[model samples]
Target: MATLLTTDDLRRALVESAGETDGTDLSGDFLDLRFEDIGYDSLALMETAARLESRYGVSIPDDVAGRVDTPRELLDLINGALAEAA
Candidate 1:
């Protein structure tokens, strides 16, 4: 079975890819916030997506990655990829 990606995992990936921004909290009720609002730009998100792909062994297309604005959308994209891989 494929391992499922959780919000915690996403948090880890985000931090691992791009060090946590000062004065920003990724924990607790942050799923709906835009990445930019949390101090993560598109490049940071792309880096995070790369880390997730490496860890989960799933490919995330550039176009798909570019389309994600919020954490929820990114989460859905990753989990959907994982489900398909499973």
Candidate 2:
């Protein structure tokens, strides 16, 4: 079996991302949750991207940065980046 990335992992990352950057501990099922709903904005998103980069080795490009509006999208993007890195 392959080691697949899960949304749950991303969920925690997102929560920590917001908590670390904006000082807001975001909580909820992020799979269908919007970042805006959790009070996250571009700054938070970019901070999360940096977190992903350092923790997961996923580099988020600018084009895809704005497209990350939801946790699921962020997961997909990170997974894609991971695959690309691999």
Candidate 3:
């Protein structure tokens, strides 16, 4: 069976990607969540891209970095990236 990405996994990932500081969980409706709420900025954006690419073996689209604004949207992006990686 395929392992679907879960909220917990993404929460842990957010923590790790944030270097274990300024981490926040978006298990709830991430569709309304903001990147700034999770302390995301230009540096964090680069880190996130590297983290997802290296950890999940996925390469995110260049446009994705600037387009995604919420956790739900980000999850969709992540799932797509995982699929592409596979």
Clashes of each: 0, 0, 0
Model number with the top lDDT: 1
Candidate 2 lDDT score relative to the true structure? 0.70
Q: Candidate 3 local accuracy as lDDT?
A: 0.66
- For residue 15, what is the lDDT in candidate 3? 61
The TM-scores of all predictions, comma-separated, are 0.86, 0.74, 0.70
Q: Write the per-residue lDDT of candidate 3 for residues 1-30, one digit (tens) a residue.
A: 455566666666666667645636555655
Worst 10 residues of 3 by lDDT: 20-29
lDDT-superior candidate, 1 or 3:
1
lDDT of each: 0.80, 0.70, 0.66
* lDDT tens readout by residue for model 1, 1-86: 65788888777777877765655778866788887777886777788888888888787886788798888898888888888887
List the candidate 2 regions with Cα displacement exceeding 4 Å: 1-4, 20-28
Pairs that collide, model 1? none
Error of 2 at 52 (Å): 0.5
